[PDB]
Each structure stands twice: as structure tokens, then as C-alpha cells.
């Protein structure tokens, strides 16, 4: 019960949104607040930086640390084709995360609906 209202207090407050502007060839970047971000962007993350939202992996093999959100003691490792959430830490690999949800719609605003029916 006290989690329940943890759980939203993880998220992160900034992201790094990159651009291409000549071809593939050209990349440029803007760290913008996690309300001026879109379901639509990839964003880096960085060795000792914190999630904002969840989303998809296709770049990098850090381990995560999510030993609150999903339970793992022990941290979990990712790869390109992997899948992370909002409030976990990221370590050494370095990845590149795709969002299909923002900083309202995540999936960790969905996971305390369910909690709540928990007790």
C-alpha cells in the first residue's frame, strides 16, 4: 500500500531525443522533460541513468536493475530485441529504447490498477 503510490514517484523527469538531418549518415541530439516527448521518438540511455516510461530495445546489452518494479534481486540483462519498464536503472552496454507510451500512458500506470485489487 505504501509501493502503490511509489511505484508513480520512480519516474524520471528528462530524455534524450535524436535526430537525423542529411541521411543515416548525420545524428544529432536534444535532451527535452519526459512531457515533451512522444510515443513516436527513440531515446538513448546512459551508464548510471534512470527510465522515464517503458519501452522496446534495438541497440546495446546493459543489465538492468528492477528489484522493485518487477521483483528480479538479482538484475536482468537486455539485448537489441529486448523489452525494459519506467523506474529501473541502466549499467554498462548502453541501449537504445523505442516508446510506445508517455510519461501518463505507461505501462507503470497500468500496473497500479491491478496492485490496487492486490491487498
Do not use: W, Y
Not at 62 to 84: C, N, R, Y
Request: contains cysteine; hydrophobic residues 40%; aromatic residues 0%.
Amino acid at each position: 500500500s505504501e509501493a502503490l503510490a511509489k511505484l508513480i514517484s520512480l519516474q524520471a523527469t528528462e530524455a534524450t531525443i535524436v535526430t537525423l538531418d542529411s541521411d543515416n549518415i548525420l545524428l544529432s541530439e536534444e535532451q527535452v522533460d519526459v512531457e515533451l516527448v512522444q510515443r513516436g521518438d527513440i531515446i538513448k540511455v546512459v551508464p548510471g541513468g534512470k527510465f522515464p516510461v517503458d519501452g522496446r530495445v534495438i541497440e546495446g546489452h546493459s543489465m538492468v536493475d528492477e528489484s522493485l518494479i518487477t521483483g528480479e534481486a538479482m538484475p536482468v540483462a537486455k539485448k537489441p530485441g529486448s523489452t525494459v519498464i519506467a523506474g529501473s536503472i541502466n549499467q554498462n552496454g548502453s541501449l537504445l529504447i523505442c516508446a510506445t507510451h508517455v510519461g501518463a500512458d505507461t505501462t507503470l500506470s497500468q500496473i497500479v490498477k491491478l496492485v490496487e485489487e492486490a491487498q
